[PDB]
From Swiss-Prot:
It is linked to Agammaglobulinemia 2, autosomal recessive: A primary immunodeficiency characterized by profoundly low or absent serum antibodies and low or absent circulating B cells due to an early block of B-cell development. Affected individuals develop severe infections in the first years of life. Expressed only in pre-B-cells and a special B-cell line (which is surface Ig negative). It comes from the Eukaryota. This is Immunoglobulin lambda-like polypeptide 1. Associates non-covalently with VPREB1. Interacts with SYNV1/HRD1 (via N-terminus); this interaction leads to increased IGLL1 ubiquitination and degradation in pre-B cells, possibly through a lysosomal, not proteasomal, pathway. It is found in: Endoplasmic reticulum; Secreted. Critical for B-cell development. The chain holds residues 59 to 82 of 213 of the full protein.
Length: 24
């Protein structure tokens, strides 16, 4: 299935909302 675009925001978002590492 096309879970590479409609699902990319699934794990990716976690890097912007779940991964608040030391960076601005």
């Amino acid at each position: 299935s096309r879970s590479s675009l409609r699902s990319r925001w699934g794990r990716f978002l976690l890097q912007r909302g779940s991964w608040t590492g030391p960076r601005c």
